[PDB]
Amino acid sequence: EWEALEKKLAALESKCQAXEKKLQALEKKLEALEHG
């Protein structure tokens, strides 16, 4: 339905937001290795 699609979009926004945070966390560990 329309309301189901709104909630689906909001959940996907939260998933990309967690995506960015997880990538930053991994970048931090990689950069420690790259300059260590």
Q: How far is residue 17 CA from its own chain's centroid?
A: 4
Helices (H), the chain: 2-34
26 sits in the region (left: phi over 0; alpha: psi -120 to 50; else beta) called: alpha
30 binds, among Zn ion, a copy of itself, none (CB under 5 to 8 A by kind): a copy of itself
Binding interface with a copy of itself (CB under 8 A): 5-6, 8-9, 12-13, 15-16, 19-20, 22-23, 26-27, 29-30, 32-34
Binding test (CB under 5 A) with Zn ion, winner from 1, 16, 34, 36:
34
**Residue 22 CB, nearest approach to Zn ion (Å):** 14
